[PDB]
Write a protein that binds this ligand. Sequence first.
Ligand SMILES: NC(=O)C1=CN([C@@H]2O[C@H](COP(=O)(O)OP(=O)(O)OC[C@H]3O[C@@H](n4cnc5c(N)ncnc54)[C@H](OP(=O)(O)O)[C@@H]3O)[C@@H](O)[C@H]2O)C=CC1
Ligand SMILES: NC(=O)C1=CN([C@@H]2O[C@H](COP(=O)(O)OP(=O)(O)OC[C@H]3O[C@@H](n4cnc5c(N)ncnc54)[C@H](OP(=O)(O)O)[C@@H]3O)[C@@H](O)[C@H]2O)C=CC1
Ligand SMILES: NC(=O)C1=CN([C@@H]2O[C@H](COP(=O)(O)OP(=O)(O)OC[C@H]3O[C@@H](n4cnc5c(N)ncnc54)[C@H](OP(=O)(O)O)[C@@H]3O)[C@@H](O)[C@H]2O)C=CC1
Ligand SMILES: NC(=O)C1=CN([C@@H]2O[C@H](COP(=O)(O)OP(=O)(O)OC[C@H]3O[C@@H](n4cnc5c(N)ncnc54)[C@H](OP(=O)(O)O)[C@@H]3O)[C@@H](O)[C@H]2O)C=CC1
Lengths: 244, 235, 244, 235
Amino acid sequence: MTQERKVALVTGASRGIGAAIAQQLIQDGYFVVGTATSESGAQKLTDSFGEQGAGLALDVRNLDEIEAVVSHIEQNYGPVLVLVNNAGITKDNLLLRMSEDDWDDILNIHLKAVYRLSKRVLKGMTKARFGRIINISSVVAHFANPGQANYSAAKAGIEAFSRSLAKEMGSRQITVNSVAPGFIATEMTDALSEDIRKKMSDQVALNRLGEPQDIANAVSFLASDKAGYITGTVLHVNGGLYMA
Amino acid sequence: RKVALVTGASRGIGAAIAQQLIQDGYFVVGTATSESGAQKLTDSFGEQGAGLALDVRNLDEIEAVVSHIEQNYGPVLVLVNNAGITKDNLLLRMSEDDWDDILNIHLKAVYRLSKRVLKGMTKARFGRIINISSVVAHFANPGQANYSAAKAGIEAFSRSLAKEMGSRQITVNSVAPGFIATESEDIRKKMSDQVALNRLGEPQDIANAVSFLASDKAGYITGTVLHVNGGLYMA
Amino acid sequence: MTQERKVALVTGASRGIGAAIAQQLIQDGYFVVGTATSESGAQKLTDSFGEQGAGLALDVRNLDEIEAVVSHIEQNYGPVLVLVNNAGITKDNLLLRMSEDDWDDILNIHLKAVYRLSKRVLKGMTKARFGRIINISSVVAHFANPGQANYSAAKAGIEAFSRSLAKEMGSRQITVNSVAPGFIATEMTDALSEDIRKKMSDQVALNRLGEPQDIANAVSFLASDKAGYITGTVLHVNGGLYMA
Amino acid sequence: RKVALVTGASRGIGAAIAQQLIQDGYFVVGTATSESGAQKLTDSFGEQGAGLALDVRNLDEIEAVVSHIEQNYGPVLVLVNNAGITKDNLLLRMSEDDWDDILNIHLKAVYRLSKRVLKGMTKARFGRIINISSVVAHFANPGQANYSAAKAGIEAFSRSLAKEMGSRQITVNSVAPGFIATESEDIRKKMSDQVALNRLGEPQDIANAVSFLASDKAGYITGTVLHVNGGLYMA
Ligand SMILES: NC(=O)C1=CN([C@@H]2O[C@H](COP(=O)(O)OP(=O)(O)OC[C@H]3O[C@@H](n4cnc5c(N)ncnc54)[C@H](OP(=O)(O)O)[C@@H]3O)[C@@H](O)[C@H]2O)C=CC1
Ligand SMILES: NC(=O)C1=CN([C@@H]2O[C@H](COP(=O)(O)OP(=O)(O)OC[C@H]3O[C@@H](n4cnc5c(N)ncnc54)[C@H](OP(=O)(O)O)[C@@H]3O)[C@@H](O)[C@H]2O)C=CC1
Ligand SMILES: NC(=O)C1=CN([C@@H]2O[C@H](COP(=O)(O)OP(=O)(O)OC[C@H]3O[C@@H](n4cnc5c(N)ncnc54)[C@H](OP(=O)(O)O)[C@@H]3O)[C@@H](O)[C@H]2O)C=CC1
Ligand SMILES: NC(=O)C1=CN([C@@H]2O[C@H](COP(=O)(O)OP(=O)(O)OC[C@H]3O[C@@H](n4cnc5c(N)ncnc54)[C@H](OP(=O)(O)O)[C@@H]3O)[C@@H](O)[C@H]2O)C=CC1
């Protein structure tokens, strides 16, 4: 077999925003490698992507796994020319109850992972004189939320990292951007009550929660030639929940 | 087709926006300051658009133009405020006329045209207002206090209006171009040296950003500034 | 008589924030000219300031009055070396009901006035190689409020103007800054209900409305030598209502 | 007197902050990475402060130092997180150690020390946490991705904590210095050319900003970044 499409890597593609991003990038014409934290989840991704992608197990907290996954992609499918850092979790707590592990795990899964994966894909993107690094941030990197000091610090750090890397890599036509979702309908919000979803949508100028596909549409735009002169920015997709 | 109105569509950014929105499937009314320019617009757009003369400083012309569009083509459901000029000067040499003309052509025009299209957009429960701003509304440039004030005002206006109209599914956004190629060689290099991507942009880059915002792919984006400056300024 | 103190001009000093600013600048050692829209209001200012200031009538919508007032100050008290643009009103309306006059009056009173007064005091500040221009903005130049498109546009324009002028005048050691108040207790908020003031304070991290003196303290800081390396900024004084 | 804790008070910005807070009426505990540096701090502060050795990378030392202050001087009611270093490199040459050390010394230290002082500030219904950031958290600089990420993270941390602690009248703010004179002549001119005020700043400018934020004159300011950069970067 042959693999002639440009390769996109989407971390945490099992569901919701990550799944929508991965499927959209497939529709756009990429060969998409998506990751999950378990081999079973990776196999589910393989099944969903069919012959235009692949699922791989990855814990983004571990440098050896990051390096092994990117090496596998390079050896089997091609250079990673679109990297979407989407994998994440939250470990919320007011600071007085935020443990060392609460802090470290979130910083490692979000910010350190962005540093490690971006560094690891630079050589191939430089070689191609083409690259897209698209980091999933959050509205709370801008509009502070009590109980999420770790998550907010990590996402804001990601945005500043992205500015630095955009400056370092711009001459090679590699763009580095962040997408900041607002209130997006996921399993989590599905689990909330109707009244609380209404409280949330009342804060949104467009008067509704967003959908994973809205984030996918933003990522797809940034990954395309239609955004070749956009780098070092935050693309806010929050329905007017936060305006800058 | 849905009707888009693009002011100052004669050349450069405006012309690229108008042509892209035609490609996207809109019927595009583009405007120029003269009947001759309007006719050239009509000729380029063919059966997918129309050219009209409009000085955006004049409220009567704004109302006549929008009424004409409503009577002949349909409600204005995409409004792109692109028309503009500069009258640069250090503040000590910036006259009342230099200030007022820039504020009127940019900010007042945005107020007047947005107000005039609200009714049709409200009826349709669909709308795109896309205002052309500038990097200098963020990264200040000596000699452009009037232009900078007007564009920043446009961005704040857009946030307020986005809040007012969001429930009706009308989005209001700004696109802020950086250094875009218009026409000065060693100086060009100075400009490109400030850009992370190490080159000047093209009108089509701005057209692509506007096309994105005007489409269903941006239906959950409102009240934002989309910077298209190659890393010249990073927010 | 003699007038040896540096001269500060505070527009709209009759009450609230402007009155607190004017009195604080007097306490700091300035000779303070404050303005009101009527001769009676100007006389009240003269009475409050005593022999360390003066009250003058000024409608900031009129260039001839601006030029006459600054000329009077220069001829009677000294060059305006601290300018605080505080005068203002609101004319709120959703855009569909916002008239041409609603728009124009607000833009003229806020933004055009800042342009005119700043331009008029530049020569004296340049001559002194010292200057402070301090523009009163608003949190709504950042956090959008429906019904205030004119006021928001004007204050945001003022902030951008201030950046431009800061760049133009920095070599002469003239600083140009804005102070953005949040919810400050004034006659207007006094006229609101207790329940609505509680609704407001609930949005504020510090859980209370501010006081005019908080704004005065910010202006006093920026006008002093303790802020000689601060220019082109917005100093937010809103108790955490809006964080940037 | 109320007790202020200033990390990295040996020289420059930290030393200026510590001396200014002494002048303001605080009892200042300043820290250094060695017992000798701590002794020099003790000597300079005299009867208005004390010097202690502290590596902010080590949680045990943080807890021992704050406990010692509580047992000997009083609750820490002003915390200034100033200690830091740089380990610059383009990302392709930035090692895991270069990244981790900077993140730990800046951001992790801010998390740990802020957490450790919350109880005393909550009891007093008074507190000032003032974190030293940098212009490069806003205006990116090649080679400083780690430093930039850490300082931006500190600013977002500060906003979150300001929301958590505001009801108790504890403010949490950042001060972002620009180009501040430390120690390279024609290059100095390049730096000053980027500054609207056309000169490098001094440590005392940063001390003045911190002194303002730590005082009653800033009791309604929380969750902000106070830029002190002479117009190098305008927000
Ligand atoms: N959800 C929302 O409403 C919002 C989300 N965001 C951000 O967008 C992204 C999407 O969030 P969400 O849609 O909630 O994604 P989900 O929480 O729905 O699923 C998260 C994904 O991350 C993966 N993941 C979790 N921990 C690790 C790890 N240690 N190593 C590798 N992969 C891991 C999971 O793998 P597995 O499937 O095996 O668990 C899963 O694929 C996140 O970065 C989040 O911060 C921002 C704003 C709003
Ligand atoms: N060009 C650039 O590099 C950058 C431009 N921008 C902004 O992008 C937009 C496009 O810039 P640019 O392409 O230079 O366009 P201009 O600002 O030069 O605008 C020219 C167009 O506007 C029309 N126009 C001028 N005055 C009026 C008026 N009073 N009423 C109606 N139409 C008027 C002209 O009509 P006619 O053809 O008849 O003269 C022409 O179609 C502007 O808002 C500009 O400020 C932002 C940053 C960079
Ligand atoms: N009040 C608040 O809570 C907030 C206020 N601000 C801003 O801070 C400033 C203070 O607002 P506020 O405290 O309400 O001041 P007030 O509304 O209490 O009084 C306003 C002052 O402005 C003067 N004024 C009004 N129109 C004119 C005019 N055309 N020419 C000259 N002077 C005029 C009045 O003069 P006279 O006394 O003769 O009427 C009065 O002195 C304003 O710029 C406002 O936008 C921002 C955020 C919150
Ligand atoms: N200096 C400048 O131009 C600018 C600096 N900044 C920031 O302002 C702050 C001050 O900068 P600068 O004056 O250069 O200070 P540094 O970043 O050089 O910090 C030096 C001080 O921190 C101490 N320190 C270093 N490592 C540790 C550690 N692991 N644990 C505890 N203390 C430590 C040093 O102790 P010892 O004396 O024992 O070595 C010394 O007191 C920093 O956060 C800096 O990043 C921001 C922008 C501009």
